[PDB]
RNA sequence: ACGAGACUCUGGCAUGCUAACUAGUUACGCGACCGGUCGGCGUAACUUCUUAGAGGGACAAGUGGCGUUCAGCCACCCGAGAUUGAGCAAUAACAGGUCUGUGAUGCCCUUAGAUGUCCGGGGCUGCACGCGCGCUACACUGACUGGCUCAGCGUGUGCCUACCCUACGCCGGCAGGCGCGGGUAACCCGUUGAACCCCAUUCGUGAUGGGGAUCGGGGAUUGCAAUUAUUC
């Protein structure tokens, strides 16, 4: 049983399976704070202290994430967690608390529950990159 | 109640310049725990100036060779040298950086002569946005040249260059190039 | 700490001009037969404290390092990690200090030039043979 | 020259050989009776304040 | 065997869709329990060649693309009924294969 | 109580497993400790001198994270950048013999061992001991 | 021929290493190596030794960027 | 009227729909302490992540400013998105290139070289040289076991031919050989465990562990011979 909420950034995508619990947060065999980078750690911690530990104390959400790159796997765990919390609150308890948390998250970061649409652009022949071109002599 | 990293506060900072305060963002809703957020600042005007000043400052850190595209390394070298300036001074690093930017952002310098002309240069006002751009660029470049061909490593040249720019020491590249820009502005009346 | 006796500044293994400031295994690379990886393996096998330089150590360490160097087969170093394995004429054995076998491996090059061989004469003319193309080499300071 | 700030009140347009200078009307918040044309450098919005240690010079206009 | 597999391979989505609809229509004519048409990922055969038959000109590359679409249906029916079902109505462009499941 | 493998900071966790391997001695004593260059892509000296013990602990970590790993796979977790000299760099598989000998050191020793049909089986002794090591690391100086 | 920087714990090294250095808040290997004219390796070794002596607390160290913070 | 645009494929949003033991989310027999890690399983909540099928969605649509008070431009609550990237691309032309694609071609080769069969060997891999694309370096933002964490496009069992990707154990620090085979493929490689971020031990301003003909010797592929040897 999941809140069916998902969350993406770049080709990466994360979903928070949700159940009734006491706010224990886990990410693919690990909790939310033992993630390897230890410098992107603040990016993962953004929600849990952006709105407080109390709101993350009555719901158990396990965030499964599949995608490329370290940082692109981030911005998916955090957004999935925040949007899963907002959807859980919206569909189960009420909207007033849900509306409050949504306003808080949007004010801190408007792209906290909306996906980042940008994707890597294709490459065109006669150049290595999307917009870079091969050097030639005049 | 948002603090930069874990201990820097955003209530002890004050601009007291009135010239460039809307293009510096440290006390407003733009407060965050990690100087790494990507964002859509560089995809439109009237939205590029809403990036937090520390975010822009860490964004412009990486440059030259493979060093570009290593924003996480910039976060590390920014937590470093900021611990260093806070231990060297004891003051709040954000206010010191704001002082360095106010002291380093050029006010007036030369461009083309009004309607038309390219033989010489004519002095004009520098926009606050371009002046913070120039201040950040001089800070980064002076730091990386101070590290260049030197025994001392990174996270030092940033620290000393920033602290001299805040204080006005001529060993700072940012404010010496500032005074250079106003001297060209004066000499090109 | 300060050692009160027998501090050396010009270290010497065998007629080699090497620095005494250099770290151990960073100065003994001057051997034209072995060095770097082989040196690291030899010193790690000889049970030397790497955390020390080449001056704050006793003479016995250098003595045993030299003995294990000149006798690779006596102290468990395989016949694959070294550069005198069997070749033309007779198989070479024992790697000795400095150009003790580098002269031996240049005299075979001398033989190759003296026999008038295509590879040999191209070695004599200064044209590398192991697979080196020639489109820009020999253009600066050529005759 | 006395130091007196000026605030942007209208973005007149672009000038310069490569079109980098910007003509903009700037007003001093001391009498609101003076509104001088200033050429400025760099990205300039509408409504900011330009620090002016020098004001005896004017931008080409009219 | 009881488990029969119907494989539909088609480069054209329209003909594949029509064939799948016709097969489901036939399996609806006679009461037969059917699993929904499983759509596997399409295969994009991107191959790039040089436009000019010589070396003269700018670097111009034709990027030819062939897309292959895959449908699978699994049924519980005897071989005679499946055989009757398959050849009731088809349209050229789709390849139909009957396999043992 | 109970504490598993994955909820422990992997750095000091693999350090603790290496120390446990040194203290145990139940394994086949390594016969090459510094005579090899380890990975094919790597033409630079090893340092720790414990690469057999630490690589055995790493192998155990990798079969606990992903059951069924062996040599051919272990090469794929121990592959790395290969600087081809004047040419640019590529990816290179490690040493299949080194990982194979590490597995044979692990194999049949009652914490982990690889079969001949596919997959990895984990004995109660090994999993209990490793979970206890993880819990001791967590509650000793990583959690109060 | 080669530039000379002290690679040993010498009289100049032992001088102003445990009494005058803590008076300066900036305690990093580069500053030490410049002050007493040694290499970076010896400065890192000296700060590691004085940390092992239990004088000054640590903040961080990745490979050569190490921070010491005083208490007085 | 053609071209532009429109068009098509793409990149982004639908918890709306047709639905999927070649995909997972839900189904539990150590509950390892008296509420928990699973792809260590301790061997029938159904399409939410995955899969592109049919519809929908964005139109400068609302507000404000400027503007023939038009066409439009700028700024914003809102919204997935307020300019995705490509494909195609007119009239005319160039003595642009291509006879090195062929009875698709208009001229010479007919008298034993007429190529329709053929080559044992070397040529553009070798040179006093000037040039053009790109890589490895330009530092102590760099390195000296790398210890732990991931995806993306997509290719792969062949009848002109063992001429594939290879999972797993054996032989060795090594190129490589043996076996059982998994894969004709969302069925196996593959959950495609590289680049990276770390470090309470080791580089320190060299000409060098920032580096290459690191000169020369140890290597070899169920397939004509690795010769200024394009594999190692």
Curated annotation (Swiss-Prot), chain D:
Record-listed Phosphoserine modification sites: 35
Keywords recorded for this protein, A-Z: Acetylation, Cytoplasm, Diamond-Blackfan anemia, Endoplasmic reticulum, Nucleus, Phosphoprotein, Ribonucleoprotein, Ribosomal protein
GO cellular component terms listed in the entry, alphabetical order: cytoplasm; cytoplasmic side of rough endoplasmic reticulum membrane; cytosol; cytosolic small ribosomal subunit; extracellular exosome; nucleolus; nucleoplasm; ribosome
Listed GO MF terms: RNA binding; structural constituent of ribosome
InterPro entries hit by this protein: NA-bd_OB-fold, Ribosomal_eS28, Ribosomal_eS28_CS
Pfam families: Ribosomal_S28e
GO BP of this protein: cytoplasmic translation; maturation of SSU-rRNA; ribosomal small subunit assembly; ribosomal small subunit biogenesis; ribosome biogenesis; rRNA processing; translation
Cell location: Cytoplasm, Cytosol; Cytoplasm; Rough endoplasmic reticulum; Nucleus, Nucleolus
Keyword Disulfide bond recorded: no
Subunit structure of this chain's protein: Component of the 40S small ribosomal subunit. Part of the small subunit (SSU) processome, composed of more than 70 proteins and the RNA chaperone small nucleolar RNA (snoRNA) U3.
Protein family according to the UniProt entry: Belongs to the eukaryotic ribosomal protein eS28 family.
Stated name of the protein: Small ribosomal subunit protein eS28
Organism this protein belongs to: Homo sapiens
From Swiss-Prot, chain E:
Post-translational note: Polyubiquitinated by ZNF598 via 'Lys-63'-linked ubiquitin chains when a ribosome has stalled, initiating the ribosome quality control (RQC) pathway to degrade the potentially detrimental aberrant nascent polypeptide. Deubiquitinated by OTUD3 and USP21, antagonizing ZNF598 activity.
Example GO molecular function: structural constituent of ribosome
Cleaved signal peptide residues: none
Compartments it resides in: Cytoplasm
Positions bearing N6-acetyllysine: 18, 59
Cellular component per GO, a single term: cytosolic small ribosomal subunit
Entry annotated with the keyword Transmembrane helix: no
Biological process (GO), any one: cytoplasmic translation
Modified residues (Phosphoserine): 77
Segments forming a coiled coil: none
The keyword Transport is annotated on this UniProt entry: no
Known role: Component of the small ribosomal subunit. The ribosome is a large ribonucleoprotein complex responsible for the synthesis of proteins in the cell.
Family: Belongs to the universal ribosomal protein uS10 family.
Subunit structure, as described in the record: Component of the 40S small ribosomal subunit.
Protein name per UniProt: Small ribosomal subunit protein uS10
Organism field: Homo sapiens
Residues of the full protein shown: 17 to 117 of 119
UniProtKB/Swiss-Prot annotation, chain F:
Result when mutating residue 56 to P: In DBA1; affects protein stability; does not localize to the nucleolus; affects assembly into a functional ribosomal subunit
Effect upon mutating residue 51 to R: In DBA1; affects assembly into a functional ribosomal subunit
Superkingdom of the source species: Eukaryota
Record-listed N6-succinyllysine modification sites: 142
Effect of residue 55 to Q: In DBA1; affects assembly into a functional ribosomal subunit
Gene Ontology cellular-component annotations: cytoplasm; cytosol; cytosolic ribosome; cytosolic small ribosomal subunit; extracellular exosome; focal adhesion; membrane; nucleolus
Main location: cytoplasm
Mutagenesis or variant effect for residue 100 to H: In DBA1; increased protein degradation; affects assembly into a functional ribosomal subunit
Modification Omega-N-methylarginine occurs at: 66
Subcellular location: Cytoplasm; Nucleus, Nucleolus
Claim: Phosphoprotein is one of the keywords in the record: no
InterPro entries for this protein: Ribosomal_eS19, Ribosomal_eS19_CS, WH-like_DNA-bd_sf, WH_DNA-bd_sf
Residues with PTM N6-acetyllysine: 22, 110, 114
One Pfam assignment: Ribosomal_S19e
Subunit relationships: Component of the small ribosomal subunit. Part of the small subunit (SSU) processome, composed of more than 70 proteins and the RNA chaperone small nucleolar RNA (snoRNA) U3. Interacts with RPS19BP1; the interaction is direct and mediates the integration of RPS19 in state post-A1. Interacts with RPS19BP1. (Microbial infection) Interacts with Sin nombre virus nucleoprotein (via N-terminus); this interaction probably mediates the loading of the 40S ribosomal subunit on viral capped mRNA during N-mediated translation initiation.
Similarity annotation: Belongs to the eukaryotic ribosomal protein eS19 family.
Protein name listed in UniProt: Small ribosomal subunit protein eS19
Gene: RPS19
Curated annotation (Swiss-Prot), chain G:
Family affiliation: Belongs to the eukaryotic ribosomal protein eS25 family.
Gene Ontology CC entries for this record: cytoplasm; cytosol; cytosolic ribosome; cytosolic small ribosomal subunit; extracellular exosome; nucleolus; nucleoplasm; nucleus
Primary gene name: RPS25
Major subcellular site: cytoplasm
Keywords: Acetylation, Cytoplasm, Ribonucleoprotein, Ribosomal protein
Role played: Component of the small ribosomal subunit. The ribosome is a large ribonucleoprotein complex responsible for the synthesis of proteins in the cell.
Residue positions where N6-acetyllysine is found in the record: 2, 11, 19, 25, 53
Species, as recorded: Homo sapiens (Human)
UniProt protein name: Small ribosomal subunit protein eS25
GO molecular function: RNA binding; structural constituent of ribosome
Modified residues (N6-succinyllysine): 11, 53
Biological process, per Gene Ontology: cytoplasmic translation; ribosomal small subunit biogenesis; rRNA processing; translation
């Amino acid at each position: 049983q999941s809140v069916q909420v998902f969350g993406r950034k770049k080709t990466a995508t994360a979903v928070a399976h949700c159940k009734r619990g006491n706010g224990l947060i886990k990410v693919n065999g690990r909790p939310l704070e033992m993630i390897e980078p230890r410098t992107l750690q603040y990016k993962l911690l953004e929600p849990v202290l952006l709105l407080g530990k109390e709101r993350f104390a009555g719901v158990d959400i396990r965030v499964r994430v599949k995608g490329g790159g370290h940082v692109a796997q981030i911005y998916a765990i955090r957004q999935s967690i925040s949007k899963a919390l907002v959807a859980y609150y919206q569909k189960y308890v009420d909207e007033a608390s849900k509306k409050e948390i949504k306003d808080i998250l949007i004010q801190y970061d408007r792209t906290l529950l909306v996906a980042d649409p940008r994707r890597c652009e294709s490459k065109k022949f006669g150049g290595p990159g999307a917009r870079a071109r091969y050097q030639k002599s005049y | 109640d948002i603090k930069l990293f874990g201990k820097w506060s955003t209530d002890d900072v004050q601009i007291n310049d009135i010239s460039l305060q809307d293009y510096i963002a440290v006390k407003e809703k733009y407060a965050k725990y990690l100087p790494h957020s990507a964002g859509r600042y560089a995809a439109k005007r009237f939205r590029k100036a809403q990036c937090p000043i520390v975010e822009r400052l860490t964004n412009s850190m990486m440059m030259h060779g493979r060093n570009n595209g290593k924003k996480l390394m910039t976060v590390r070298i920014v937590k470093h040298a900021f611990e260093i300036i806070h231990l060297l001074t004891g003051e709040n690093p954000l206010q010191v950086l704001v002082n360095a930017i106010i002291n380093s952002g050029p006010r007036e310098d030369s461009t083309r002569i009004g309607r038309a002309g390219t033989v010489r240069r004519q002095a004009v006002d520098v926009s606050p946005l371009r002046r913070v751009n120039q201040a950040i660029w001089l800070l980064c470049t002076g730091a990386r040249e101070a590290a260049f061909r030197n025994i001392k490593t990174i996270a030092e040249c940033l620290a000393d260059e920033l602290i001299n720019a805040a204080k006005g020491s001529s060993n700072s590249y940012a404010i010496k190039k500032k005074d250079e820009l106003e001297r060209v502005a004066k000499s090109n009346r | 700490l300060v050692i009160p006796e027998k501090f050396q500044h010009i270290l010497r293994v065998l007629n080699t001009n090497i620095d005494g400031r250099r770290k151990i295994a960073f100065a003994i690379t001057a051997i034209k037969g072995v060095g770097r990886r082989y040196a690291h393996v030899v010193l790690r096998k000889a049970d030397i404290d790497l955390t020390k330089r080449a001056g704050e150590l006793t003479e016995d360490e250098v003595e045993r390092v030299i003995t294990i160097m000149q006798n690779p087969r006596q102290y468990k170093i395989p016949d694959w990690f070294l550069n005198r394995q069997k070749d033309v004429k007779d198989g070479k054995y024992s790697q000795v200090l400095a150009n003790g076998l580098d002269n031996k491996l240049r005299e075979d090059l001398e033989r190759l030039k003296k026999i008038r061989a295509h590879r040999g004469l191209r070695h004599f003319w200064g044209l590398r043979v192991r697979g080196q193309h020639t489109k820009t080499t020999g253009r600066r300071g050529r005759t | 020259q006395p130091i007196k700030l000026a605030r942007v009140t209208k973005v007149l347009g672009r000038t310069g050989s490569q079109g980098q200078c910007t003509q903009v009307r700037v007003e001093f918040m001391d009498d609101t009776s003076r509104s001088i044309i200033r050429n400025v450098k760099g990205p300039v919005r509408e409504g900011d304040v330009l620090t002016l240690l020098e004001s005896e010079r004017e931008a080409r206009r009219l | 065997i009881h488990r029969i597999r119907i494989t539909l391979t088609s480069r054209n989505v329209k003909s594949l869709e029509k064939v799948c609809a016709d097969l489901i229509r036939g399996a609806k004519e006679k009461n037969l329990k059917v699993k929904g048409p499983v759509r596997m990922p399409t295969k994009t055969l991107r191959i790039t060649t040089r436009k000019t038959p010589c070396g003269e000109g700018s670097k111009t590359w034709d990027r030819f693309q062939m897309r292959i679409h895959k449908r699978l249906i699994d049924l519980h029916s005897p071989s005679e009924i499946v055989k009757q079902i398959t050849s009731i109505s088809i349209e050229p462009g789709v390849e139909v294969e009957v396999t043992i499941a | 109580p109970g504490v598993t493998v994955k909820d422990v900071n992997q750095q000091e966790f693999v350090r603790a497993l290496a120390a446990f391997l040194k203290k145990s001695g139940k394994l086949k004593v390594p016969e090459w400790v510094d005579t090899v260059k380890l990975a094919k892509h790597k033409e630079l000296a090893p340092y720790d001198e414990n690469w057999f013990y630490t690589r055995a602990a790493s192998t155990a970590r990798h079969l606990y994270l992903r059951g069924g790993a062996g040599v051919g796979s272990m090469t794929k977790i121990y592959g790395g950048r290969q600087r081809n000299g004047v040419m640019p760099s590529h990816f290179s598989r490690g040493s299949k013999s080194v990982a194979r000998r590490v597995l044979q050191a692990l194999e049949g020793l009652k914490m982990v061992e690889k079969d001949q049909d596919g997959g990895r089986k984990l004995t109660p002794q090994g999993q209990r001991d490793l979970d206890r090591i993880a819990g001791q690391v967590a509650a000793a100086n990583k959690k109060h | 021929d080669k530039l000379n920087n002290l690679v040993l714990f010498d009289k100049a090294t032992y001088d102003k290493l445990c009494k005058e250095v803590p008076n300066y808040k900036l305690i990093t290997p580069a500053v030490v190596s410049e002050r007493l004219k040694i290499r970076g390796s010896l400065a890192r070794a000296a700060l590691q030794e004085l940390l092992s002596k239990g004088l000054i607390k640590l903040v961080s160290k990745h490979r050569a960027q190490v921070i010491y913070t005083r208490n007085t």
